Amino acid sequence: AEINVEATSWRRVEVGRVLKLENGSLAAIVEIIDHKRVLADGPSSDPKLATPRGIVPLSRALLTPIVIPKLPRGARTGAVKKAWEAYGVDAKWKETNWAKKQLQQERRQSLTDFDRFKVMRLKKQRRFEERKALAKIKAAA
Amino acid sequence: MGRLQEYQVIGRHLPTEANPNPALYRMRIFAPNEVVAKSRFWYFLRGLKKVKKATGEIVSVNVISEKHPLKVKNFGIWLRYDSRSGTHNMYKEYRETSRVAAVEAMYADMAARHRARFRSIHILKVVELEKTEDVKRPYIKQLVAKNLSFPLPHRVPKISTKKIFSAKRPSTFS
Amino acid sequence: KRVVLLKCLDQGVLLVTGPFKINGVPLRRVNARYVIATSVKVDLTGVDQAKIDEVAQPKYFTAEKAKEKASEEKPQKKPVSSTRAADQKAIDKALIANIKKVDMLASYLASSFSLRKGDKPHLMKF
Amino acid sequence: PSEAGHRLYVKGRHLSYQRGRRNTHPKTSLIKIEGVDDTAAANFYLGKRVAYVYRAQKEVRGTKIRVIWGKITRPHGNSGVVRAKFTHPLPARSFGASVRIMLYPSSI
Amino acid sequence: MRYIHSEETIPVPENVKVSIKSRLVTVEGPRGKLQKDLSHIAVNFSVVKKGVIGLEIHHGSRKDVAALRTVRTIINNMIIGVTKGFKYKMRYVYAHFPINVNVEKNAETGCYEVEIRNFIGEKIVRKVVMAPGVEVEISKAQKDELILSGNSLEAVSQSAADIQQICKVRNKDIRKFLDGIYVSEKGNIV
Amino acid sequence: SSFESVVVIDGKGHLLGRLASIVAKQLLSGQKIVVVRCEALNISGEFFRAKLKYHAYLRKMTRYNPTRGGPFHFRAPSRIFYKAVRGMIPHKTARGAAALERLKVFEGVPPPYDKKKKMVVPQALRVLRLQPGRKYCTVGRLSHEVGWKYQDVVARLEERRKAKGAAYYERKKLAARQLSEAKKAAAAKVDPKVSEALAAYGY
Amino acid sequence: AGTINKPKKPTSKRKTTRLRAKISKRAAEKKRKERKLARKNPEWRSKLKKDPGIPNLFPYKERLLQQIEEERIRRKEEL
RNA sequence: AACGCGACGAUACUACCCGCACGUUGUAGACGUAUAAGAAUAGGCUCCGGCCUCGUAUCCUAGCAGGCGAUUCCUCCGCCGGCCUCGAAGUGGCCGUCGGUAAUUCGCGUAUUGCAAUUUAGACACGCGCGGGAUCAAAUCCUUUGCAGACGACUUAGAUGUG
RNA sequence: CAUCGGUUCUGGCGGGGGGAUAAAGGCCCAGGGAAUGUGGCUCCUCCGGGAGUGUUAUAGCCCUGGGUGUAAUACCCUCGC
């Protein structure tokens, strides 16, 4: 009975699923209200990733690949904070490519005119070596 | 019907020589503000007792805030609404975090499903279901199930309405 | 162009310099409503404030303007006064000495500014 | 040689006059600035000077190019369109033409 | 009401090999191979158990829940077709003029071709071309019987229906004139 | 928001009226718009309603002389889209006429638009607008059923264009792979101070 | 019906001013006429209204009946 | 379509073509007016390791509106020629010559437009020019015909002939 | 361009007052209770997980009272820059 099914695999909203809100902060689902809203708590030590406990609409949230394992339904802020520091949600979020893209975005928007000029100069300096390497690669093969 | 707040409105008949201490009547009224709350108090009191606004007074208006706005709760609302035929009962249930949010969801749902306005709906009882065995509507019973986890297929990405043209066809899988 | 502010004069006028050997802008007056203040700040240590005030005297620039205009009106360059040239060199020697310490700042001041595609002035930090 | 541009202004388009459904008022013009998409972004360019540059036939005082000067007064709507007032009302034929929003007078 | 989750199960025999990709079901069996495009129905396929295919709909209405039964029956019929096959036995009866049926296999098209002649003494020669995969034979065990066999139930039943509809009496009493070709038996080959 | 010299739009997967409204607003704002593959545009609702509407359109004709003044019914998908756009523009004025001269519509992707970037409008995309389970159709099928004669010619030209684009895609994959190896090779020769400065700046 | 291949004359939704004014006046005259026939109507009308009652699916209907019975006994004891 | 399009033949004349030589010449309106996979959206991309909300991206972007001389580099761009190639309204690839070229660093010049005044700068089309190369054509009126015709229009014929 | 006056649009900041002296909530203290029953135990098994038991265990939750507390914040009103 060889069954070869290749189908889509969505991320699921569940108790312990970590959401990323529009402001850049993180939350964890502690109880599901309906198919459009959840109850969430962001008890992170970092002020940027912190989110007050409350109702989160699922339209304004993004499903991160971080799920806190074995989190009880309706656990209060102390229990969610204990699970957060136990699982190390912050470190996994820093390893997540979404936060790397966000950090790159902040580094790009925090530039002054002198910074942009220096970026252009160092990018040309790097581009010289990349162009030489590409020319060598095309010449060899 | 708007950002609603629940008020206790306590009123009474004006004291006379026959009754130096008239009876006090307290009601729990959902209204956008205190003027509407007092108007609804006088309306419901005219519907039950020999008191009107010109012969009575408002002893107190207080705001009843939710004890636990951070706890997900099931609410059962028993209501009467007036249609072309007459007055009919409805029992409905809402999974919300406060009585006021349940009442706004109630008003939106009755407006959407039965074309009933604010002027034609009487909120008779709003109760909390202490146990999940008291839940009767299947659309709440599917939400109070054990280990409820579901995906969200076909999520249209939120793209800014001021950005007219995009160079990539968007995906609906995140 | 990118210049260095030396002193804020009265009624919105500013005293600026290039320096002259860096990008070609001499000692000059500008208006504060037509400049953008970049967050970088060149150290003024070694630049003499007495000569800065001497340039900031009210009739340092507007004097003899009718004289060069009448003298020049084959085309020929209007001659720069020896006082202007000497003050320009004396102010900008220490300024160039301070600029050369910071890396890429001399090239940054020699280069010109221009808006590119996607450059939004309401979101930039200067 | 240098391989860069020489632009120190923001591009804009002259959309229409201040109007209702039927009655138009040429004394005030509507301009869409490039990259400005809300009132918070338009607040930066309130007060800036905007020029409409066009080309005429007869050469007057060394050029065949004429400029109408004006400035941005207030935002219009919610989508970053701004209202502008010029020394003379802009031509009705220039609906859709390009205008230059300069960075002066500067508060930075 | 929008049901959060609804699911169906399809058991698969050991001989059957099922490959599903982008709602394109390919079923392989001892008798042959069938292919079907179910891209018009929003179904999520999965393997919930070894040898069981799971059909699911999330946040669907009652119609979307009910369509899973049609999908289940279609895939089950494909499995039954590639495992045992489908067979329609038809009988042609006549009153006075004997009906002549000749079955050939057009090789360039690779399909069977049934030729019907002398129906109510008519001089026209009716011709029905079969769907690919449908094999038509004249039964030697019984009298005036055609046998249509295949792996596709839709193809076999539609070919049998085409044979039944092409021989239809017109402008006559159907109480008196009883002639035609009729589907007698419907079943499996094995 | 960005002003461009010309905006080339892929008509595939787009809704006719929403794309027409957005294109007409851009045309009156002063932007040149070239829409290609108008046979792949979409109309919401299943095909019989669009066929009914076009036959009701075909019913309307002037009585005394059908060679003048009457509604001229165009069976091409490009000019169906052009009619949809022209209904949204004050075309009887000089401004509306000049706005319409900034628009070009085609069936398929004729050269040199085959070697140009084709953008999409997310406010009119059928997959992002219509609810799943709702029915739709294509403008090309309606055009073919009401009298368009060049469905097959445009089709064959499209497989030729797609084969040439596939060859271009293999070339672009090879170029991207060699660029990646060039970056990996140049990572060992560029100054670490420069690399650290660029990484800190966000590049 | 062969509507799709051969449509008929469309039914116009664009109402005319004559029709709008006439419909409004007939509606007002009908309202006055039904008010007159309501004042002249001899059909019996109950003063009391038949109350719909309490729904069966209300989970605390038993507790509400307990409360009503208890308040009835309290009022009878007070009286 | 008499304000839709294509192919072909011959093209006198300043008429045609090539180069630079510029416009009180015209343009619903240059200012980096940069960017080709297809396809699916209850699934895709890949270098096969993994990746996918995100074009908030990539390329390009420094110098008298961008000079001169070096130090230095073999990177980028452009004009020609050859070979291929591109028909949906036809154009790109490779090779070779030539010319330019901060990826690093330095010197000499910038002023005086006087505290802002469009940064007169691009493209296409047109005209006047010269300096060169190329070619020596038709249509109409008129006479005639009757396959035609109210009149125009149309089918013919008129240069040596089978007139 | 600077400094002003009249009218007006818009942004930010520093305070005060009120309500259940917000309601919550965090951290402690003292009780009580339940399941969409955690750990444990038992029985089935495709051994992937289900089923039963009971009140915290190798998760937690709910209700009541007290302390931090004249806590913060939301909302409304208000004094200014």
From TrEMBL, chain A:
Keyword DNA damage tagged: no
Family of this protein: Belongs to the eukaryotic ribosomal protein eL14 family.
Alphabetical list of Pfam families matching this protein: Ribosomal_L14e
Example GO molecular function: RNA binding
InterPro entries on file: Rib_uL2_dom2, Ribosomal_eL14, Ribosomal_eL14_dom, Translation_prot_SH3-like_sf
Name recorded for this polypeptide: 60S ribosomal protein L14-like protein
Gene Ontology CC terms: cytosolic large ribosomal subunit
Organism: Chaetomium thermophilum (strain DSM 1495 / CBS 144.50 / IMI 039719)
Gene3D superfamilies assigned to the protein according to its UniProt record, in alphabetical order: 2.30.30.30, 6.10.250.2270
Entry's Gene Ontology BP terms: ribosomal large subunit biogenesis; translation
Residue span(s) of domain Large ribosomal subunit protein eL14: 52-127
Keyword entries, A-Z: Ribonucleoprotein, Ribosomal protein
From TrEMBL, chain B:
Large ribosomal subunit protein eL20 domain boundaries: 4-126
A cellular component term, taken from the record's GO annotations: ribosome
Sorted UniProt keywords: Ribonucleoprotein, Ribosomal protein
GO molecular function, one term: structural constituent of ribosome
GO biological process terms, semicolon-separated: translation
Pfam families the UniProt entry points to: Ribosomal_L18A
Superkingdom field: Eukaryota
Family: Belongs to the eukaryotic ribosomal protein eL20 family.
HAMAP family, per the entry: Ribosomal_eL20 (MF_00273)
Entry protein name: 60S ribosomal protein L20
Organism of derivation: Chaetomium thermophilum (strain DSM 1495 / CBS 144.50 / IMI 039719)
From TrEMBL, chain D:
Pfam family, one: Ribosomal_L35Ae
HAMAP family tied to this protein: Ribosomal_eL33
Keywords carried by this UniProt record: Ribonucleoprotein, Ribosomal protein
Entry keyword annotation includes Ribonucleoprotein: yes
Source domain of life: Eukaryota
Lineage of source species: Eukaryota, Fungi, Dikarya, Ascomycota, Pezizomycotina
Any one GO molecular function term: structural constituent of ribosome
One GO CC term on file: ribonucleoprotein complex
Name of the protein described by the UniProt record: 60S ribosomal protein l33-like protein
Stated family: Belongs to the eukaryotic ribosomal protein eL33 family.
InterPro entries: Ribosomal_eL33, Ribosomal_eL33_CS, Ribosomal_eL33_sf, Transl_B-barrel_sf
Gene Ontology process terms (BP): translation
TrEMBL record, chain F:
Pfam annotation, one family: Ribosomal_L13
Record-level GO BP terms: negative regulation of translation; translation
InterPro entries, sorted: Ribosomal_uL13, Ribosomal_uL13_CS, Ribosomal_uL13_euk/arc, Ribosomal_uL13_sf
Keywords: Ribonucleoprotein, Ribosomal protein
A GO molecular-function annotation: mRNA binding
The keyword Ribosomal protein appears for this protein: yes
Gene3D superfamilies: 6.10.250.3250, Ribosomal protein L13
Any one Gene Ontology cellular component term annotated for this protein: cytosolic large ribosomal subunit
SUPFAM superfamilies documented for this protein: Ribosomal protein L13
PROSITE patterns found in the cross-reference section: RIBOSOMAL_L13
Domain of life, per lineage: Eukaryota
CDD domains linked to this entry: Ribosomal_L13
Function field: Component of the ribosome, a large ribonucleoprotein complex responsible for the synthesis of proteins in the cell. The small ribosomal subunit (SSU) binds messenger RNAs (mRNAs) and translates the encoded message by selecting cognate aminoacyl-transfer RNA (tRNA) molecules. The large subunit (LSU) contains the ribosomal catalytic site termed the peptidyl transferase center (PTC), which catalyzes the formation of peptide bonds, thereby polymerizing the amino acids delivered by tRNAs into a polypeptide chain.
Family (UniProt): Belongs to the universal ribosomal protein uL13 family.
Protein name in UniProt: 60S ribosomal protein L16-like protein
Organism of this sequence: Chaetomium thermophilum (strain DSM 1495 / CBS 144.50 / IMI 039719) (Thermochaetoides thermophila)
